[PDB]
Amino acid sequence: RKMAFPSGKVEGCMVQVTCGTTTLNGLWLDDVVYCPRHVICYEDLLIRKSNHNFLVQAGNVQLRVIGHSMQNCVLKLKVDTANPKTPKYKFVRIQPGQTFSVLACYNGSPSGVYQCAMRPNFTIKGSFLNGSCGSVGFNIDYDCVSFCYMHHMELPTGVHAGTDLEGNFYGPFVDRQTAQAAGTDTTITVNVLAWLYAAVINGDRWFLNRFTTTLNDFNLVAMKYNYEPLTQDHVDILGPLSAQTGIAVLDMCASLKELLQNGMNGRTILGSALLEDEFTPFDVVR
Amino acid sequence: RKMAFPSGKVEGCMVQVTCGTTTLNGLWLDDVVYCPRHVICTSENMLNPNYEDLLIRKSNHNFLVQAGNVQLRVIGHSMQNCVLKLKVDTANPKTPKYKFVRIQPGQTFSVLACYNGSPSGVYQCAMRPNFTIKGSFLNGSCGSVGFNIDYDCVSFCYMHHMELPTGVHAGTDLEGNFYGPFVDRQTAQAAGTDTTITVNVLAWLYAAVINGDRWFLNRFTTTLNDFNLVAMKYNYEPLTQDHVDILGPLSAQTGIAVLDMCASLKELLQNGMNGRTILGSALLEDEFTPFDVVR
Prior knowledge:
Two copies of one chain form a homodimer.
Chain A (H helix, E strand, L loop, with lengths): L7 H4 L2 E6 L2 E8 L2 E5 L6 H5 L6 E5 L2 E3 L1 E7 L2 E6 L8 E4 L7 E8 L2 E9 L18 E6 L2 E11 L5 E4 L25 H13 L13 H10 L7 H6 L1 H7 L3 H14 L18 H5 L1
Parallel strand pairs in A: 8-12
Antiparallel strand pairs in A: 1-2, 1-4, 2-3, 3-7, 4-5, 6-7, 9-10, 9-11, 11-12, 12-13
Helix pairs in contact in A: 3-7, 4-7
PDB class: viral protein
Keywords: SARS-CoV-2, main protease, viral protein
Assembly: dimeric
């Protein structure tokens, strides 16, 4: 099973932000609420705004905006009181292929939690309800919350686009009503390899063969099947799993090369009949 | 996406229960800690434990309960079926609004997997028709609980007790009664043949229609009897008139009669997916309920 992180620490940070007739989710940390700047639908639009234009609700309580400011594509609303439920936290930016949990929220109220990967085309295959704008993604490492994502937009193909918590978009997207579409996506090779290592650790070994391939030879098969190219960085990352199982990375790649041409052939790997790519090497170790 | 419930209300209830050399998770609600009774078992007891004999020999101070950095004082103990119930000094300040419920096969719920009392991950689940859980249980997840959350009220429906030889998981409701024919004993017990939850696949196909996908529909219908004769050859659960009644609302919203959706499923089982996907899945998904789909 994919598992999401326990969401309790983030749940106590979610609030509702309303400007005019538009309402979405915000993240309340210390005395600042963070939310997508498109709540004010940007240089002009925010000069004309004053504090009384923003209504922040932390459950029953209304919060008083005493200052506002923009950072890239996120609005930073300073409020009268600090969130007593603020966890230890940091803002971080992730890379395609890395995984995180999303707390989907409806008008400030947490609705559900799921585990994601940042796709190579920088979008998120998520299930986002009406009014989930401003929901955040995060990892938890030893009671420290690493916030890595804030949801902004649904793209026509169903997937989702957002920013880091400093307002920098992931991917070539803008927060305007322009026609935009996800680029062609790609399977995350290093995560498939990690998931095959987890299958071996779990006793699934039928796909193991006696052969080894080269980095160059694999990457040609990889692009023929729309797979991210494998780097020496990926190989080194999978090192602990190769040590743990005795299967070298380029021998697992031969295994993967055969899977991409024969299929599981009525067999399964860990119960699936497709190759899972939303588990990172780190995820498998933990 | 399959989503789990936000886990915060349950995280504040998780504690660690230690008895002798055995440690697992407990659930701290008001002034009672619930946990699996095999916490009182040693190695030499697993095969044929006599729980009433083992429990009579314990006193309150044999039970070390820890809520984070704080030891809770046990002031009484009692056994109800296969759950131990430890009365403590202190009512949990973070006790949510809650109830205990017993669920049926096909029902879904979230599991907060914990290790030694600390929550580690959350996932969404279905009770399989053979009364097991296809869980993801780290080495010390005994006593982790499953739940639903409706309008801020938590329904506790499952407590984890053991992994079966086939990799799946068995456990009880919060009254200590096992789901299925399993026992908290290290015997040669095995899960029955697992079947697909038919009513959940059909509800999900209705969810595919509501989301615009219709490629799998066909012009046929079927009788209920004929549908079940076919589906059982694929290890699908028989569909009852109650299931039909339950899908009525989704049949209403989509204009597709239940037995017409059944004919579509019969053909999907005959043909496979032909490399296509239905919602975002290339598999027939059976862990979303009719109730879930309306949400």
